[PDB]
Symmetry: C3
Subunit: 198 residues, 3 copies
């Protein structure tokens, strides 16, 4: 069954599954996250589809950053209370998540050997960088910086694995104006990391 | 069989398999396209090797764009009449294409759930961006912009899936002078998308 | 056995496994390289963790390039005497290298059909480009250019496959401008190439 090689959020969930902004008091966007087992690595495929007005209106600002913090327990299961993503991940079932148990969830996690916790000497190894784009109302591509930090620092005793994905930009002109903003959508960002063993 | 997880053009086809320019009277380049099933995703690996002098001479201009439009039917089979690529894709057979029937061709296609057709409010989700490089005669790397649009709009009724790939550059100087232009080759660009189910 | 789809260095080797710089008294860094078979392609995942003080202090200079030269024999075995990486690759065994025979080592190699040797007219096809980042002591990300040349030129009769990975920067400011005591860590760079057949 190839479906168990994927751990994901499903494609375009009906309702917002993620509370990205600190100012938000409920889910403000759809986090689309797909983790695929690819040999010793995980192929991580991530983007956001904005839902709340305040999140969508971030496209009108010149200086923005927002972070999806994903915390997982020792079994590789998402801790929804601590995490930005409020719906657990599961396997592929068509375009949706499966509903059963998760096979080898821990082996989707970022390796604590490759990406340690509380190790100042190896702190640089926890960082992955890249770019994605916001497609503007005029069809131009607005580049957005992405920083991923794997593990490095835990926030609670039961947080065994961490993925923190930060989207940011600092420009002279905002992606949109107040009247042109619609939905904050980031283009998919694919990154790779050495996966934990079961 | 691992070979059926690849749907591709084969390596460096003897003859030009693609008509990139409308002004060309026949195939003017080799489109190298490899689609690999990677869990819930497809790994899409693409570049061009120019063949015709007119296409190759595009490297002598400062402002250029060209697009490979790939249209597929409901079975996931290439519609060569509509598409830039004039030879159907098939599975891996060594460095070449297999000649038999394609297994699960529909699941190589970009998801219509992830990448809808004619949906204005979700149109931003259809776009993927990146960069490749042209290796110049002096061995400097000339960056080329890439815009990919999946599905979004279908030009004919039997078209069920679309992959449109646009290479472009707009610079102060052309990649090559008149006496240094040889072959327009783009470095491989790899992108990812959520695949359709069978 | 999925473990045989990876050919790698293992995670964070105890000792430096690579001599990046010709002048170094011994191995000067940890080359972390993971090659994963992905359909017709190899997903190549590479970065460097500096070990020696002389190599780590390269980040204080403004115009630096260094290259990992990886040479393999006709069976796909690393030729350590000729190569920057001085420890053979092997399969995944947890976070470490396996210690047995390598299964189908040849099909991890860059295709000589896709990436020829001594063919000037096709030389542009041998190149892959990208960027990674050096994380500075202030935790800012400094972009580093990466160039990969596959095959193209052999250095000895038994060198059947070559992977040459060059990290470089040439900017107004050095990657590290705040201290002489910080580890040269490059963020992971992932590239793709068409693999040889067994």
């Amino acid at each position: 069954d190839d479906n168990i090689n994927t751990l994901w959020t499903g494609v375009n969930p009906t309702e917002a599954n993620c509370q990205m902004m600190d100012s938000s008091e409920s889910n403000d966007c759809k986090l689309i996250l797909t983790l695929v087992k690819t040999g010793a690595l995980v192929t991580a495929f991530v983007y956001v589809i904005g839902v709340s007005n305040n999140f969508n209106m971030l496209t009108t600002y010149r200086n923005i950053n927002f972070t999806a913090e994903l915390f997982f327990d020792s079994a590789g299961n998402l801790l929804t209370s601590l995490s930005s993503l409020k719906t657990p991940l599961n396997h592929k079932s068509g375009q949706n998540m499966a509903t059963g148990a998760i096979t080898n969830a821990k082996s989707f996690m970022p390796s604590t050997t490759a990406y340690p916790f509380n190790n100042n000497s190896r702190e640089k190894e926890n960082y992955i960088y890249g770019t994605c784009h916001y497609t503007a109302s005029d069809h131009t591509a607005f580049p957005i910086d992405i920083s991923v930090m794997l593990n490095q620092r835990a926030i609670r005793a039961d947080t065994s694995y961490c993925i923190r994905i930060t989207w940011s930009w600092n420009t002279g002109d905002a992606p949109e104006g107040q009247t042109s903003a619609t939905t904050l959508v980031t283009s998919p960002f694919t990154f790779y990391y050495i996966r934990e063993d079961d």
